[PDB]
Amino acid sequence: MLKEGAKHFSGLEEAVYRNIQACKELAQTTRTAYGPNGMNKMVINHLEKLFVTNDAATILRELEVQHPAAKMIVMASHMQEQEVGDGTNFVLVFAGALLELAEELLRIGLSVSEVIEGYEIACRKAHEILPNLVCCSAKNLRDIDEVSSLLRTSIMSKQYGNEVFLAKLIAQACVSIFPDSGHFNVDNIRVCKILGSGISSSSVLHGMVFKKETEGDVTSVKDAKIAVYSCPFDGMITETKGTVLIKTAEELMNFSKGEENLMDAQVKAIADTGANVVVTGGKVADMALHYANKYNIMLVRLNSKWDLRRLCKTVGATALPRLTPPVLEEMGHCDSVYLSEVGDTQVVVFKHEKEDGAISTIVLRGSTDNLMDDIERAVDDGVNTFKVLTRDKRLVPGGGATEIELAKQITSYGETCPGLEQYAIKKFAEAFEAIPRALAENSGVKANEVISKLYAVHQEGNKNVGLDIEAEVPAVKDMLEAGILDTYLGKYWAIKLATNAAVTVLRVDQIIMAKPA
Amino acid sequence: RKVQSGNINAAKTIADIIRTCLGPKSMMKMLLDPMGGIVMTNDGNAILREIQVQHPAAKSMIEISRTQDEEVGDGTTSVIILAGEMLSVAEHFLEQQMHPTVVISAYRKALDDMISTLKKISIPVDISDSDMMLNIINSSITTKAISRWSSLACNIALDAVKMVQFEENGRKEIDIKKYARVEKIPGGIIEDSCVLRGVMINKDVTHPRMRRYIKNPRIVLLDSSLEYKKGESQTDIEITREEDFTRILQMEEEYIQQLCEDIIQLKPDVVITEKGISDLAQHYLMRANITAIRRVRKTDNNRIARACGARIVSRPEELREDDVGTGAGLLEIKKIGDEYFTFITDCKDPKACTILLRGASKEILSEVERNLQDAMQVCRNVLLDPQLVPGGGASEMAVAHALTEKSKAMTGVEQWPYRAVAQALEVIPRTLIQNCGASTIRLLTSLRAKHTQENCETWGVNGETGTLVDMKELGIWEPLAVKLQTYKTAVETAVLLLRIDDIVSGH
Amino acid sequence: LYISEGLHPRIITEGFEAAKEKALQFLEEVKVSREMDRETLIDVARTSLRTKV
Ligand SMILES: Nc1ncnc2c1ncn2[C@@H]1O[C@H](COP(=O)(O)OP(=O)(O)O)[C@@H](O)[C@H]1O
Ligand SMILES: Nc1ncnc2c1ncn2[C@@H]1O[C@H](COP(=O)(O)OP(=O)(O)O)[C@@H](O)[C@H]1O
């Protein structure tokens, strides 16, 4: 009319309408998960493989939204993912509940400044009262079952069938390097995929693990310097066709002898300069393997971009895809390279640990390539959850037993200070009842009776609804002795990011115009 | 579950019509006619009567409101608003899971708690003195009427109310509708209205010949069975010829002789007759030491059935020896004014006095009639229960606070509908604040924060300025039975509208 | 115009009543008497005829 060119529908009326419906529709396609349930969703983009996923991270990473209100939350989601390990759907659910509860306050007839002030006061009160429900704590990280219980509790959120063997393997792989005290890195653990048997035959191994065959000889010396290259066995001599049937044998024999002499001089110069082995990334030839066998030089076969990228980012060399024989400028720190036979396959093992910065690589094996993705996701999630950078994790009884207590505390605190700030406090307290409802609705029973039962027992804060059929209607269980706890800092960061996103959404709300060319 | 939604939609549509017609500062509606007319009025009952709907729920609500207005006479507007608010706050929020069972029990518990709270807050009063009653009547009648001669009218109405009560026997029955009417006669000074016996006689008695004067006789009225009939139960005599006409005289003479020989010892006077007037038979009837009157309408029938107690039955002769006519009754035909007036004093069934007013035109008649009506209604509503409650918007807040406290103390499962029906009682103060012209949020918050300290339940909102004032210094009080009846009617309407399943057709 | 600007009809009615009372008081205080004779009635009739015919 005066600013927009019949593109958007913004103005002095979409404040309590279009700016909330988009977020509601975005969060509606996410409440189906959140909990140990089988709600797989197929993802079809560009790979054209038809794979089903369960986590919301891969679902949100493939969906393309064209709305600023929906794009204002993916930034906070990525920030929370970069900060701590888990935590993604909680922020979205909290923001959706806050928006749905503020829609009524905006429709009644209240300004946004009072609502923002009340939300900030409620968030400050929740942050102040949060360090008060600490029950269990981490004792010694040098044991096995102490971290195995936490790993099992973290894995049970994803996979429900098998969760003990994977947790034990992750614990054994993490305890063989360095604990949380001192310094512990994350990009020092690699996951390899082996197409063979099922998942009931996995093992662990310290050092580098790569599925690369060897058609030469076993070189177990320390002077075998590595030499990575792009495509050294490509084609230094391009041969063409003269006639149709065949040409003269003299020219072909001369060209073959010249190429053989050239490659012999090349391998002699590359072996006499201080490099016994060579990393190739091309094809093979009969004379090539013959020279590699008669010169005692290890020759690989399998080539991959990820392998050379990891070798470059770990050692620090540089591939030289040149025709003329260059000089030795790829000196690294590796020296102990051994060969092993695993699953009738030849694997390499690198030994260069000096009790500092050790690496590990767990051996994984499955049926198809569409099943190891969830295993790798669970493994990396458990690895990220194990890192907390503190000796005492100060675990709290998660699963919804603390949300009701926090809501009751906020409700009891709000019924004291007079003024027009009680409605926002009551809304922030009632918004905390969105975690048990989503967990009860995704099981098979209702959620009103579960909430009534949870509010009718006692204010102990250690009661939550179970997962079996004998724990849906009563929902009276003690999760303190079972071993179901959550991260203390994770919930705090999630609440902080949700409050920040809600404040940013409620602030920027007026007229959405365009920009001139 | 779509019939209940369609019912509550029409209920809210009907309720959202006369919502802005409460309080001293009310709005004014206007209805246009299809022919080309427009009438502006501020009466909700007129709009409800002139409306035409098609939904059965709306017709049922209109009939309930009409019955409530006809039975009591005060409190027939807020019932629909309260019912609509309760419906919109309960069914339009607690029916997503379809469970119409515990809602009835919650409504019953809320009604019982409201009744208990309203009963445990009333204050006693005395009815010995008369100045307090007159002050209460003047304070309750100061709504939208003139102020010039209200004191005398209210005093006369109070006297008539205190004089019309005589049917006491343990149940306290008061009837003033069909027991006390209003009379009008122009001429004379306007400052002479009072109470009298009241006899509905204007120009019905006709005496062609001059006879004796009536001083203090003993009139014994009979029945009306002397018209153009064929006798008792057979067709042996029929009025067709002049011979039958002249034999009717002898038949009536024989009948009056039989009556005199049977049960005539106090010598009655006039008798009720519907048909029978001439210039020859009437002379013989007057000479037979008896008189007869004619021209009887519905007012005279009601007067002789209420004050005298005359019945209608097929039995003119052979009655009770002591039926009616017990006491010396004077019947002097006075010439005061311009018409014949009778003053039957001291007879059967006393305490049946009517009013006597001498105004002018029809405007004075209408104004004194409406003044007497509203004053008698106020007196009947006050004398029915000697308990007053400080209105204006102070008892509802205390009731809601008590209900919320009880719900928080019981810690039950159905606490959500209880809280929803308890928080749906602050509609009258919000409407008053909106009509006054102020903020409806800050004032409501201040009223909620004030009704929770220590001993503070008489602080309401002024209906003329827009501030919170104590009811102990203003003087706004309401009866107790009216609020209980309103709450019971609202609960019954909600229960009836909540128990509606499917609707079909039949014969 | 005052309603479109933002006000309530009750305050407008109160102000109108106050202005009417003030105008009535001013008219009652500004009145003056004059002896009725022949020239006054002649002038009144002339003004009436001029305003009519
Ligand atoms: N086995 C279990 N028992 C009880 N609660 C569980 C279990 N598994 C997961 N949860 C709950 O489900 C919630 C979501 O977990 P998760 O999916 O790991 O995080 P996010 O939803 O942020 O991705 C957690 O807050 C946790 O309390
Ligand atoms: N001076 C006053 N102060 C406070 N409240 C008042 C005053 N005058 C009237 N009201 C309120 O205005 C309302 C008028 O109700 P009314 O329209 O008579 O109901 P109905 O139409 O059912 O008879 C009363 O409930 C009373 O509480």
Side-chain angles (χ1 to χ4, degrees):
Chain A
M1 177 80 146
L2 205 59
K3 290 302 163 300
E4 311 164 0
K7 188 123 179 295
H8 281 276
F9 253 80
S10 87
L12 308 167
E13 211 259 355
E14 54 97 19
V16 206
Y17 213 90
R18 274 80 174 266
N19 257 348
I20 314 170
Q21 282 296 320
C23 305
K24 284 173 57 179
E25 278 167 15
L26 174 68
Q28 192 66 246
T29 77
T30 326
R31 208 181 285 267
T32 59
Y34 199 84
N37 74 317
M39 215 59 60
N40 303 339
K41 298 178 180 67
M42 338 189 82
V43 177
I44 301 107
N45 185 34
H46 274 162
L47 305 103
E48 311 295 317
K49 43 178 59 168
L50 195 79
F51 60 97
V52 280
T53 58
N54 239 331
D55 55 337
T58 80
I59 295 172
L60 277 188
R61 93 177 182 87
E62 299 277 354
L63 258 187
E64 313 287 88
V65 292
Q66 310 291 331
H67 264 270
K71 267 193 188 69
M72 218 89 74
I73 323 185
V74 302
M75 297 187 186
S77 293
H78 288 66
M79 207 164 181
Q80 190 68 246
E81 166 73 35
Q82 184 179 179
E83 188 78 15
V84 301
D86 230 335
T88 294
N89 289 338
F90 188 32
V91 178
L92 266 77
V93 168
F94 212 52
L98 279 183
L99 286 174
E100 283 194 36
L101 285 181
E103 180 160 345
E104 296 168 308
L105 289 176
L106 283 192
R107 200 195 64 212
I108 283 301
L110 275 86
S111 296
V112 294
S113 298
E114 311 284 327
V115 184
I116 284 180
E117 176 184 51
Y119 279 170
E120 287 190 349
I121 289 179
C123 172
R124 218 173 291 131
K125 189 63 178 64
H127 285 179
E128 175 192 337
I129 210 62
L130 182 58
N132 270 150
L133 305 172
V134 174
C135 65
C136 173
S137 195
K139 303 287 183 67
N140 188 22
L141 297 189
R142 296 313 215 277
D143 284 331
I144 306 297
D145 213 339
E146 298 205 10
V147 296
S148 306
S149 296
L150 324 171
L151 287 187
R152 233 184 258 115
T153 313
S154 173
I155 291 173
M156 203 176 87
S157 156
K158 292 297 160 197
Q159 309 192 57
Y160 189 69
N162 312 89
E163 72 264 15
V164 185
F165 188 53
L166 296 170
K168 188 84 163 187
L169 176 65
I170 294 161
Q172 286 173 190
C174 285
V175 86
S176 66
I177 316 173
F178 286 104
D180 189 65
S181 166
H183 184 73
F184 174 73
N185 214 347
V186 198
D187 44 23
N188 57 340
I189 293 185
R190 325 288 186 182
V191 178
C192 46
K193 334 275 194 300
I194 297 298
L195 265 305
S197 67
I199 75 172
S200 298
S201 45
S202 302
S203 178
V204 83
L205 182 58
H206 43 276
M208 295 180 189
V209 169
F210 280 122
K211 208 232 176 176
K212 284 200 179 140
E213 304 286 272
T214 295
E215 298 282 346
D217 207 298
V218 177
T219 307
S220 296
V221 309
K222 267 83 74 173
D223 290 330
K225 296 306 176 180
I226 59 170
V228 291
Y229 287 102
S230 290
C231 309
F233 276 5
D234 188 75
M236 60 188 180
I237 299 181
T238 300
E239 303 130 298
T240 61
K241 296 297 290 183
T243 57
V244 41
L245 265 76
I246 204 168
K247 216 68 180 295
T248 58
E250 272 61 76
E251 190 194 18
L252 268 78
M253 184 178 176
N254 216 36
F255 283 165
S256 187
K257 223 180 153 281
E259 187 171 275
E260 281 164 3
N261 275 78
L262 186 53
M263 73 174 67
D264 191 87
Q266 281 181 14
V267 300
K268 184 87 75 185
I270 212 66
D272 273 294
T273 187
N276 211 340
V277 292
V278 54
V279 194
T280 61
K283 321 108 204 171
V284 296
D286 41 352
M287 69 276 289
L289 62 97
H290 170 269
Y291 289 150
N293 266 333
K294 271 193 168 62
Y295 281 158
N296 299 140
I297 294 171
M298 178 158 338
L299 179 61
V300 299
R301 193 176 190 272
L302 290 97
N303 323 301
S304 177
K305 195 251 192 172
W306 290 268
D307 292 39
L308 54 97
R309 280 269 79 83
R310 284 279 199 266
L311 258 296
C312 181
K313 74 164 69 62
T314 300
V315 176
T318 301
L320 312 104
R322 266 260 205 167
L323 197 137
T324 170
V327 294
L328 180 57
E329 277 223 345
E330 50 266 13
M331 295 179 184
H333 57 278
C334 297
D335 45 0
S336 298
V337 180
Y338 307 116
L339 197 136
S340 201
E341 190 82 24
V342 173
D344 208 56
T345 59
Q346 336 293 128
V347 290
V348 296
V349 169
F350 284 70
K351 305 299 286 235
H352 54 278
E353 293 89 4
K354 271 82 68 178
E355 281 155 290
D356 49 348
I359 78 177
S360 306
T361 301
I362 45 182
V363 181
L364 264 71
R365 37 188 64 243
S367 154
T368 186
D369 268 331
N370 281 9
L371 262 300
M372 312 181 197
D373 297 335
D374 312 343
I375 311 188
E376 174 189 47
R377 173 67 197 183
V379 159
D380 68 42
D381 264 337
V383 162
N384 285 319
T385 314
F386 173 62
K387 175 173 190 288
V388 78
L389 295 175
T390 43
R391 276 222 63 92
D392 39 351
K393 304 194 199 301
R394 313 220 300 273
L395 298 172
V396 288
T402 53
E403 326 286 335
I404 37 164
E405 184 70 31
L406 287 181
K408 187 207 167 215
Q409 285 263 333
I410 294 292
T411 302
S412 296
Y413 163 71
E415 292 171 352
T416 290
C417 46
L420 295 186
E421 302 172 0
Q422 41 191 26
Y423 306 98
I425 293 182
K426 285 170 157 49
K427 283 312 180 73
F428 202 88
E430 271 193 34
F432 265 117
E433 303 172 356
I435 304 303
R437 189 168 253 122
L439 278 173
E441 264 179 351
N442 289 353
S443 183
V445 300
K446 28 186 171 174
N448 206 355
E449 298 206 356
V450 179
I451 287 183
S452 292
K453 283 244 188 214
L454 258 68
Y455 270 98
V457 180
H458 190 74
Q459 303 119 73
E460 247 172 352
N462 301 329
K463 297 250 184 245
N464 199 34
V465 55
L467 300 180
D468 303 328
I469 179 64
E470 287 100 34
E472 293 293 328
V473 178
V476 182
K477 281 177 69 175
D478 209 314
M479 286 194 170
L480 184 53
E481 272 80 19
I484 304 177
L485 299 157
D486 274 341
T487 307
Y488 170 72
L489 268 81
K491 280 272 157 53
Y492 179 83
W493 274 102
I495 290 168
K496 170 191 285 291
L497 281 207
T499 312
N500 274 117
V503 160
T504 304
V505 162
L506 206 58
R507 273 176 175 168
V508 193
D509 185 20
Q510 194 61 255
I511 301 180
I512 304 182
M513 295 166 289
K515 254 184 182 172
Chain B
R1 211 73 72 198
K2 297 297 186 291
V3 190
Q4 272 105 351
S5 286
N7 286 20
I8 64 164
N9 281 13
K12 201 169 55 183
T13 294
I14 292 293
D16 261 351
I17 291 298
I18 49 172
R19 195 181 63 89
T20 51
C21 299
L22 197 93
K25 313 291 214 55
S26 71
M27 295 271 147
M28 285 188 183
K29 267 81 194 174
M30 156 186 297
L31 303 106
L32 52 103
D33 301 351
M35 309 162 54
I38 276 182
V39 43
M40 36 194 311
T41 182
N42 56 336
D43 190 60
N45 297 274
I47 306 170
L48 281 189
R49 282 210 290 258
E50 288 288 326
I51 211 70
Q52 280 186 5
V53 292
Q54 74 276 355
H55 204 275
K59 302 175 75 162
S60 67
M61 289 205 88
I62 286 178
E63 288 177 353
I64 285 296
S65 91
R66 175 187 307 148
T67 299
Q68 180 72 27
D69 202 359
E70 193 176 358
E71 209 273 329
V72 188
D74 190 22
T76 177
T77 307
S78 309
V79 285
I80 319 288
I81 318 294
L82 281 171
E85 188 84 10
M86 284 170 186
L87 281 168
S88 66
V89 78
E91 186 191 297
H92 221 110
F93 183 59
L94 303 143
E95 261 212 351
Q96 302 315 288
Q97 287 82 243
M98 305 144 274
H99 42 280
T101 293
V102 81
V103 195
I104 308 184
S105 44
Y107 269 11
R108 289 204 158 110
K109 287 175 187 176
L111 164 71
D112 279 7
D113 280 344
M114 285 181 201
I115 290 290
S116 190
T117 311
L118 223 44
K119 202 179 293 300
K120 217 187 62 60
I121 207 169
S122 66
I123 50 163
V125 86
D126 52 286
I127 58 180
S128 73
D129 44 359
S130 179
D131 291 331
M132 292 303 298
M133 278 292 147
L134 292 183
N135 209 331
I136 288 177
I137 286 181
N138 280 14
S139 298
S140 300
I141 210 51
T142 314
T143 70
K144 30 173 168 288
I146 58 160
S147 66
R148 185 63 175 84
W149 44 69
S150 315
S151 297
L152 177 128
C154 88
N155 216 325
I156 291 184
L158 168 68
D159 291 325
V161 163
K162 213 168 188 179
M163 203 169 290
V164 86
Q165 39 178 2
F166 73 102
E167 298 219 12
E168 43 94 20
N169 239 25
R171 65 185 184 270
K172 298 294 187 290
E173 222 189 341
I174 291 99
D175 199 2
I176 209 161
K177 183 175 175 65
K178 60 158 301 300
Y179 269 80
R181 59 173 52 105
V182 57
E183 284 87 1
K184 182 56 182 81
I185 175 70
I189 316 296
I190 208 176
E191 313 270 48
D192 48 8
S193 307
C194 64
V195 293
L196 86 167
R197 292 294 181 184
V199 182
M200 192 66 203
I201 283 288
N202 277 108
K203 281 301 224 162
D204 308 306
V205 45
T206 47
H207 281 209
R209 53 200 306 229
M210 295 300 290
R211 297 294 296 163
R212 61 160 195 86
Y213 196 75
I214 295 105
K215 189 53 208 66
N216 195 3
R218 304 298 178 91
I219 166 167
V220 181
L221 292 175
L222 307 171
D223 267 338
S224 184
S225 179
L226 214 54
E227 293 89 4
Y228 264 45
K229 65 185 185 294
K230 292 181 176 66
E232 289 87 5
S233 296
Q234 245 168 5
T235 75
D236 293 332
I237 175 166
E238 47 203 280
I239 310 169
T240 44
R241 303 284 295 276
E242 290 183 352
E243 203 271 329
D244 210 89
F245 192 77
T246 200
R247 195 100 213 275
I248 283 160
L249 197 138
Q250 260 187 338
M251 286 287 156
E252 289 179 353
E253 284 291 327
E254 195 140 300
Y255 287 158
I256 203 63
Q257 282 240 351
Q258 185 178 2
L259 282 172
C260 273
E261 291 303 289
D262 196 2
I263 35 164
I264 294 292
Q265 44 97 23
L266 282 199
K267 295 184 75 67
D269 297 295
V270 300
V271 288
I272 163 164
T273 308
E274 291 181 353
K275 186 145 195 125
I277 174 171
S278 66
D279 290 331
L280 271 80
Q282 209 246 1
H283 278 227
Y284 277 96
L285 256 68
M286 290 294 289
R287 203 256 314 164
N289 293 317
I290 48 165
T291 59
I293 51 177
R294 43 209 54 85
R295 273 84 178 270
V296 42
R297 274 88 171 181
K298 292 182 180 180
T299 56
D300 191 276
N301 211 168
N302 267 58
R303 184 246 177 270
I304 66 170
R306 173 249 308 173
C308 182
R311 65 182 65 88
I312 294 100
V313 82
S314 64
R315 188 176 114 198
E317 66 253 4
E318 311 179 45
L319 322 172
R320 186 75 265 173
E321 55 96 20
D322 199 1
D323 35 358
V324 287
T326 311
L330 51 93
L331 281 96
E332 286 93 0
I333 314 294
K334 304 297 293 294
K335 212 42 185 183
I336 298 170
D338 63 336
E339 294 219 27
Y340 293 144
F341 296 128
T342 316
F343 305 94
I344 299 171
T345 319
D346 291 331
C347 279
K348 274 295 297 174
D349 201 37
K351 302 306 173 182
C353 65
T354 76
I355 209 170
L356 183 74
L357 180 131
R358 301 169 79 95
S361 87
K362 300 296 184 291
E363 175 71 29
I364 303 298
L365 183 144
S366 66
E367 70 102 1
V368 303
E369 182 178 2
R370 65 177 159 100
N371 283 335
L372 259 297
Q373 184 59 255
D374 65 40
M376 284 180 313
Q377 211 67 78
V378 166
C379 206
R380 178 194 177 188
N381 267 327
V382 162
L383 218 56
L384 263 188
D385 210 338
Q387 278 164 351
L388 272 69
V389 49
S395 35
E396 265 89 0
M397 307 295 278
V399 160
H401 185 247
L403 257 66
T404 306
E405 284 300 306
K406 286 191 62 61
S407 180
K408 288 278 189 55
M410 65 179 189
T411 327
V413 185
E414 52 266 11
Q415 41 183 355
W416 295 290
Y418 197 85
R419 288 194 198 113
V421 83
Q423 291 158 6
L425 269 179
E426 311 161 0
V427 51
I428 309 293
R430 184 194 305 148
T431 312
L432 285 184
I433 291 166
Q434 177 176 340
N435 262 344
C436 281
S439 199
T440 66
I441 322 181
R442 313 183 185 260
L443 262 300
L444 263 182
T445 311
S446 314
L447 197 54
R448 190 183 300 115
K450 187 69 178 179
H451 273 274
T452 184
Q453 301 232 338
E454 183 71 29
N455 189 24
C456 41
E457 62 266 13
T458 47
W459 282 70
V461 43
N462 192 13
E464 279 168 320
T465 302
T467 47
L468 312 175
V469 284
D470 206 314
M471 284 301 153
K472 279 187 300 304
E473 308 172 356
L474 210 56
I476 319 290
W477 308 83
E478 306 183 24
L480 177 125
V482 176
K483 303 289 291 188
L484 305 190
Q485 189 62 257
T486 284
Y487 278 3
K488 284 168 190 170
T489 312
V491 164
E492 283 181 3
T493 310
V495 162
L496 165 72
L497 262 73
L498 213 50
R499 270 174 67 94
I500 289 294
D501 212 337
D502 207 87
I503 163 71
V504 287
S505 67
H507 64 266
Chain C
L1 257 67
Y2 274 130
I3 286 302
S4 180
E5 182 69 29
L7 215 59
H8 204 269
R10 283 289 161 181
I11 295 106
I12 299 284
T13 305
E14 289 190 352
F16 281 177
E17 183 179 1
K20 172 204 107 170
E21 177 54 52
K22 184 60 175 186
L24 269 190
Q25 181 53 51
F26 185 74
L27 178 69
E28 191 65 51
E29 202 257 322
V30 87
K31 82 176 181 183
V32 70
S33 158
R34 183 75 94 88
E35 191 49 57
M36 284 306 137
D37 47 352
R38 193 180 157 91
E39 275 78 19
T40 48
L41 309 181
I42 275 284
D43 293 358
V44 162
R46 173 161 291 130
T47 49
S48 298
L49 283 163
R50 283 182 184 270
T51 51
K52 291 280 109 176
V53 85

